[PDB]
Ligand binder design. Structure first.
Ligand SMILES: [Zn+2]
Lengths: 120, 69, 147, 91, 114
RNA sequence: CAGAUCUUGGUGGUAGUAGCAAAUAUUCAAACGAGAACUUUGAAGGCCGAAGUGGAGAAGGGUUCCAUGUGAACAGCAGUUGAACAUGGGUCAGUCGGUCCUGAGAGAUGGGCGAGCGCCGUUCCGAAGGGACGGGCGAUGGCCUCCGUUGCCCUCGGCCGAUCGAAAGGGAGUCGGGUUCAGAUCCCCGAAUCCGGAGUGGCGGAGAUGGGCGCCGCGAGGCGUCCAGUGCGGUAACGCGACCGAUCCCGGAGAAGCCGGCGGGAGCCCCGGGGAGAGUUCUCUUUUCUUUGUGAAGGGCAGGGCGCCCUGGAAUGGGUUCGCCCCGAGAGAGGGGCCCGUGCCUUGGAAAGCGUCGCGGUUCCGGCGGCGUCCGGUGAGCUCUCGCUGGCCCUUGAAAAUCCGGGGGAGAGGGUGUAAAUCUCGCGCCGGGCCGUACCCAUAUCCGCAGCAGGUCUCCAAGGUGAACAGCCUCUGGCAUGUUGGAACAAUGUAGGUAAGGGAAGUCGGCAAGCCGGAUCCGUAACUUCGGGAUAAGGAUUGGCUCUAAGGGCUGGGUCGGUCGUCGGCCGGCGCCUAGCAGCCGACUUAGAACUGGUGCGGACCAGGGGAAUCCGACUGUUUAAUUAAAACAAAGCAU
């Protein structure tokens, strides 16, 4: 008679507002619910750093930000990486395109002048 | 007790002038020799049935008793 | 040292006529820290936490743990942060005048020693105890006479 | 800050002991607990151990300073004069 | 279900009565009284907080039994000046010790020359 | 003798009366027996419900313990029973404690005082040490070799106080199975350990076995002379199996509080499978219930901890915790060292235990046999232990016995086959006196004049609902309702409940009981020492059953050819788990929606009545044990 009840408590029965006497902390503490969340957003965070999807620098800022719970679960961290890491790339593509052209014509400026100083 | 992991010891631990008895019990598959001395029950695990009969006769005196099983 | 707001100091000396290590419990002056070479005698220069007999120290030098009479090993001005001041020697009759913590000027015999500097632990009575209990725990550690 | 407007450390006392007593204590339960900088290392790890005794964290050197502070300004001016008196004693 | 009893005649949860449980062959959970776990030595330096590595940590009177190799480290000043001091004070000895004797030489020079 | 609230002894009326009412509860059958509301067995119904009406102890009791028997006396009725009465029986230790050590303190000689038994006093007005290595001599002993031994002296020694003081502090080493009517770490069986002795060395191994030179011999090797050897490995932390050593000196262990957080290990609980035995089968249930191991001491290895070492030098600062914290006084990163190792495997150990099924001994055996003691997973769970890290003090939170490591080198040892030494390396032999040891440990073995609702120190601590060791119900375990039963159902009580309408009109007074009572979501005043007031006040929701959404862990990377035994080690060649997807498991939770109920829904239990003012005391605290709990005392603060 106690199993048939517990198999119904797992699903949602017998556990409304009329079956609670303990404080919201007592049923499931706030220290633990936070605590188990830091061990998930930190674990994922350092499973990425070694896997080389983020780097040293990002793993720090994401470490302080998660400590101030700007990320409230795992999906919203897995996603917020996919926003930074993506827009970091596009900035790079517009950064390694800017200097590649800027200098090529600068040494090609340095070469064209040297072919001038030889031929007087 | 003491675990002994070869053969040459089992005589140097059973040729002594003070040694008392040898128990050769047939566990379900290996063999167990237990020579009782003044301080330890010197147990030798040997897992070969066709090697215990080699070691049954080679006990230092005629004493092959008392065994159980 | 429980029952005292002036923490002591385990100074380690060397017996010069046998072979061992002798230890003392000086009242610690202020500034004294472990691993420091404290000197002791008549020809040890002026510096904090370093005993030398009044008479070979200049006029105006602040001392603590000052002896009363030569050889009684420290009696005057040794509470939690008090200090006796030297005033003016008298190299004839070998006397000296000190201004004890209360204010009464004493004509102390010279040649009796006193470790320089105020006594560590000063400024103790500036925190209101604020509690009945906190005064209880204070007077339980001393002679048992509180309420 | 934002949790308490004008109490600070002495908010652990509540509505007791009065106002002016708690104000006078707020300047002492901040000096004594807070960590000073050990002069022998520069590492801010000098924390009061008991009354009038201070301990470092990395040098491991105890310094017998003031009772709620690393130094009481009289004890500094005594260290001052004794320096000055040391030259006059030896010209 | 557990129905346990102090096996000896002391019934007060004192300091020399701490216990651990065990499961005897006859399948009966019974108490066993544990010998207190002592601490390994400290440095003779006095200013290092950690304990000694190398020296086996056991109660005092047990040391009548252990062989000398289990109670010290072959290092000079072994088993009395800590292994951090073996890395510090045995360092810090020589560096303090040799040089200070060398300075005495220097002062024996500048003083004697004049 | 009539008296004195006369002394001692005795007997009435009261009176077959008051009374044998604190904590739910007993019933049916059977047995011995003269006799049965009460004793014993069986069946049923109940409670104590793991902060026990349970299983053990310390104080205390002193034979109450166990068995056989008794029906004088006591067990406020009774009794075939007893805690009673009469006979018998019972308490087994090197390892469990006492003894050993010091703690607050007590105490003697020295000294001082005192008419005096004696008193003050504990390093204090004291010639306070009776011990030791070696050395010189005399002198025995036994193989007067050699050493054990003895007296004188030389040397060396701090005298820092004799003794006593804890069955809870300190304090080496014993566990498992079985056994009786009562004892079992005490007995039997089996495995271990501490201390002490080792004296003529009881035995192995270690210090201990080199090099050059010259001879010869092809060499194997042997021939001889000098000089060495009181041990090796690692850059380092440190390791190895022992690896000389005194007077003296240094340090360590013994050896330190309370609270908060986190983590590891284990016992208990829980879930899912296999078995063995069981209750239910009116219908349903691959069923619910019990059971499903391995001690001490070694050996090996997981797992935690490191303020241990080495390479290298870091800001486009890092690493990192639940919180911290740390870093050129050397971060991350790689490699190593140590400690704990209660956990896993193994020796002990399957022989034993335990669950079942079956024989023999017709009988008292501690008998004989088949099978099994298997495979998994979760956790903020509880208890115990270990290890990190903080917080709190004007609190800083024990001594000594004992045991150990280090420094220093007075001494010993042999001259080339053997020594002196093993801070015993592995073995082997012998010894471990003395005293306590049953039982109760409490609504019955203790103190209250007793089998008294009082009082008295601790350990162990299941399932459900629930925040919870709350309250309530159940299992292991225990009991007969607490010094008696039967019949009825009057008053008065005592202890519980409800009552139409009004709601303090009662009374000195809302005395008593009565409403509010948990949790989620909204809302919150005057005042204020800005912390509080505050669960202020005041609202709404709460049941079931069916869903929805969200909050996590472990694993992953190619056809091709030959070799090696398109699967894999290898090669070469490709893939590039490329946006981060794919597969398997995993715990409870939180928010929303539909439907349904005589609108009942913290449905038993547990669980605050609020508001506006005045007087007094600041507060928390304490007191008139047995009429006064306060406005009295204390108290931080102020001041003499
Ligand atoms: Zn420092």
């Amino acid at each position: 008679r106690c199993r048939k009840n517990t198999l119904a408590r797992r699903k949602g029965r017998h556990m409304g507002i009329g079956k609670r006497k303990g404080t919201a902390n007592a049923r499931m503490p706030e220290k633990v619910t936070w605590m188990r969340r830091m061990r998930i957003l930190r674990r994922l965070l350092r499973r990425y750093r070694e896997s080389k999807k983020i780097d040293r620098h990002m793993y720090h800022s994401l470490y302080l930000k998660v400590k101030g719970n700007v990320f409230k679960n795992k999906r919203i961290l897995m996603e917020h990486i996919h926003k930074l890491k993506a827009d970091k790339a596009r900035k790079k593509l517009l950064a390694d395109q800017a200097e590649a052209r800027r200098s090529k014509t600068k040494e090609a400026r340095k070469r064209r002048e040297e072919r001038l100083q030889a031929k007087k | 007790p003491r675990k002994i992991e070869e053969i040459k010891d089992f005589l140097l631990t059973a040729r002594r002038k003070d040694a008392k008895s040898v128990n050769i019990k047939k566990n379900k598959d290996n063999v167990k020799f237990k020579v009782r001395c003044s301080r330890y029950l010197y147990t030798l695990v040997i897992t070969d049935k066709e090697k215990a009969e080699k070691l049954k006769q080679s006990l230092p005196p005629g004493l092959a008793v008392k065994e159980l099983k | 040292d429980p029952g005292r707001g002036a923490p002591l100091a385990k100074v380690v000396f060397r017996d010069p006529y046998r072979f061992k290590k002798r230890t003392e419990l000086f009242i610690a002056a202020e500034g004294i820290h472990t691993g420091q070479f404290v000197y002791c005698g008549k020809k040890a220069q002026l510096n904090i936490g370093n005993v030398l007999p009044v008479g070979t120290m200049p006029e105006g030098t602040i001392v603590c743990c000052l002896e009363e009479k030569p050889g009684d090993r420290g009696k005057l001005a040794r509470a939690s942060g008090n200090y006796a001041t030297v005033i003016s020697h008298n190299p004839e009759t070998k006397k000296t005048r000190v201004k004890l913590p209360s204010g009464s000027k004493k004509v102390i015999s010279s040649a009796n020693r006193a470790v320089v500097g105020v006594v560590a632990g000063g400024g103790r009575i500036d925190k209101p105890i604020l509690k009945a209990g906190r005064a209880y725990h204070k007077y339980k550690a001393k002679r048992n006479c509180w309420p | 800050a934002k949790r308490t407007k004008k109490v600070g450390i002495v908010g652990k006392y509540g509505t007791r002991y009065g106002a002016s007593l708690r104000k006078m204590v707020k300047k002492i339960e901040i000096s004594q607990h807070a960590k000073y900088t050990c002069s022998f290392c520069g590492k801010t790890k000098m924390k009061r151990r008991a009354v009038g005794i201070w301990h470092c964290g990395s040098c491991m050197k105890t310094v017998a300073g003031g009772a709620w502070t690393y130094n009481t300004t009289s004890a500094v001016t005594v260290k001052s004069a004794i320096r000055r008196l040391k030259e006059l004693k030896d010209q | 279900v557990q129905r346990l009893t102090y096996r000896r005649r002391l019934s007060y949860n004192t300091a020399s009565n701490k216990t651990r449980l065990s499961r005897t062959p006859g399948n009966r959970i019974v108490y066993l009284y544990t010998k207190k776990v002592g601490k390994a030595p400290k440095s003779a330096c006095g200013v290092c907080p950690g304990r000694l590595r190398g020296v086996r940590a056991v109660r005092p009177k047990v040391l009548m039994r252990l062989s000398k190799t289990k109670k010290h480290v072959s290092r000079a000043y072994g088993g009395s000046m800590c292994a951090k001091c073996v890395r510090d004070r045995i360092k810090r000895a020589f560096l303090i010790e040799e040089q200070k004797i060398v300075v005495k030489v220097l002062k024996a020079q500048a003083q004697s020359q004049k």
